[PDB]
Paper text:
To examine the differences in inhibitor specificity, the CA074-inhibited VEEV nsP2 protease was crystallized. Here, we determined the X-ray crystal structure of the CA074-inhibited nsP2 protease and compared it with our E64d-inhibited structure. While the compounds appear similar, the regions occupied by the inhibitors differ. Notably, the two inhibitors occupy different locations in the protease. Notably, these two inhibitors occupy the subsites which bind the most highly conserved residues of alphaviral protease substrates. The histidine of the catalytic dyad rotates towards the inhibitor when the active site becomes occupied. CA074 makes 8 h bonds to the enzyme. Rates of inactivation by CA074 in the presence of 6 mM CaCl2, MnCl2, or MgCl2 were measured with varying concentrations of inhibitor, Mg2+ and Mn2+ slightly enhanced inhibitor binding (3 to 6-fold). CA074 inhibited not only the VEEV nsP2 protease but also that of CHIKV and WEEV.
Author numbering: 468 to 787
Amino acid sequence: DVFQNKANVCWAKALVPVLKTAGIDMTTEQWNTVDYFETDKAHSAEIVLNQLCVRFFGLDLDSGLFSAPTVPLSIRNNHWDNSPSPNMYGLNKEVVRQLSRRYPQLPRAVATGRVYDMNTGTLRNYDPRINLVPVNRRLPHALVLHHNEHPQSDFSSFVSKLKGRTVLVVGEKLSVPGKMVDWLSDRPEATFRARLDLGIPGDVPKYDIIFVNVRTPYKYHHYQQCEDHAIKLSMLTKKACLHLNPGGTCVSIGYGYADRASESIIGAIARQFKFSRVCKPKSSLEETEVLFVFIGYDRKARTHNPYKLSSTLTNIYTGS
Ligand SMILES: *[C@@H](C(=O)N[C@H](C(=O)N1CCC[C@H]1C(=O)O)[C@@H](C)CC)[C@H](O)C(=O)NCCC
């Protein structure tokens, strides 16, 4: 009923019983504040739970707030449901007890599915603007002070100066002088036509260079833009590692890793490459936008020091 005229929102349907442990009842209109519900795209129930946890209670899942194993979130055949699996979530009321000393109204918030306003400590009706960052999370890098609405960046010049012969562009069409270009998009004039929300098709071949030319809209905060881009890093940028020639390069649009999922996904990708850096060329106008650059894919065993990329991201976003 709240899911009327939606083909791909099973993640939201599977979340209903998890959210109900914290008294939450999402209306269609409230669901519509999640971008991928509004545009009806496939998603991670887990990332959306973390997004909703922050908006409602001002805390992300590393708070332990939904760490009670009450309701399963299970993915069978690209379909999220509540079928038994050892991946279970639900309001953890011992954590609510621990948190209540610092946050007195929080127990009532999670009992009645109301927003705990981390500024006032008072209860509000659902509004995605009230809690913009998780207060429990120590951000690995600085976020931009101000954001502006700029035209889309043109990365044609940056990709043309990368080393390699065969490019796969994923998302928005990109011209690359001097290289062989295949194009992955849901546009019908694409070399490979597919839904990008289901990820890189397994049957896509291997390349020297993969460029993820996929953007995510800014709405409320750098933190929001980042967590909304997290599923694209997972479905496109991470899967690109299966589509690379040995020593190949993956470059991806991104917004840092303000959220836990982005930080984990970026760290998992980085271990597959000899070199990992964050670049912001002159072409990149939108202030939150960076390029993640992964060079020398070799599927070796290697340790990743996140402080390297975090340092670079802090410099870029603070203008240091
Ligand atoms: C999963 C998805 O949306 N699956 C659909 C589904 O079961 N729906 C549509 C919306 C409510 C629910 C229902 O009516 O029971 C199914 C009909 C599509 C074949 C979605 O594709 C997803 O997020 N996959 C996981 C992404 C990795």
